[PDB]
Design a protein around this ligand. Structure first.
Ligand SMILES: CCC(CC)CN(C[C@@H](O)[C@H](Cc1ccccc1)NC(=O)O[C@H]1CO[C@H]2OCC[C@H]21)S(=O)(=O)c1ccc(OC)cc1
Lengths: 99, 99
């Protein structure tokens, strides 16, 4: 599809039994999801943006379905105000910027 | 151009005869540049990111040429981690997401 940017590029994602709305975010290196209790091993990390840093938990090889497209990779979980699909998964679903 | 996302989508922008590198950031509503001087009236504003809120200076109707595409719009100046081109200007240059 083609997503214009008149509004926030929010799309439906699935992670296990949770459907969430998430931003397709070219400015995000990594995917950052709102607090959720995912199974498996993780490692602590700090990520920085406008305002400073937040602490997140890094989970690897997590399958995520983004608008029907399959992805699998690292997801960072922590107290973000919005779910963010970053470049690590955007590439996997074939996403480009065009103008 | 078509821009893939295996690398950060950094582009050269022209603003006030200066060349800067800025990140095409679909997860940003607003264009926010690191501390710089711009002419004219500005308004104090606050904006929030992943790490909390910051103070910025809001400049309206500023020309920026992004990859040779002309925009004229609002530019926020303040302590962002990196120069970002947000949706307010991405829309002006006809940028869309495609997958
Ligand atoms: C370092 C570049 C940029 C920060 C500039 C990175 N951010 C992604 C942005 O797209 C966030 C994504 C974001 C969106 C909404 C809320 C928090 C974060 N947008 C953002 O801060 O936009 C601000 C400018 O416009 C405003 O509109 C939205 C918030 C304001 S991020 O959320 O902080 C972030 C995401 C992933 C990541 O992985 C290492 C590290 C940081």
């Amino acid at each position: 599809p083609q997503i214009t940017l008149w509004k926030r590029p929010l799309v439906t994602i699935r992670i296990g039994g949770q459907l969430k709305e998430a931003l397709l975010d070219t400015g995000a290196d990594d995917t950052v999801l709102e607090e959720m209790n995912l199974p498996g091993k993780w490692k602590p990390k700090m990520i920085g943006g406008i305002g400073g840093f937040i602490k997140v938990r890094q989970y690897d090889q997590i399958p995520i379905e983004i608008c029907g497209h399959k992805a699998i990779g690292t997801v960072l979980v922590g107290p973000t105000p919005v779910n963010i699909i970053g470049r690590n998964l955007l590439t996997q679903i074939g996403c480009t910027l065009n103008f």
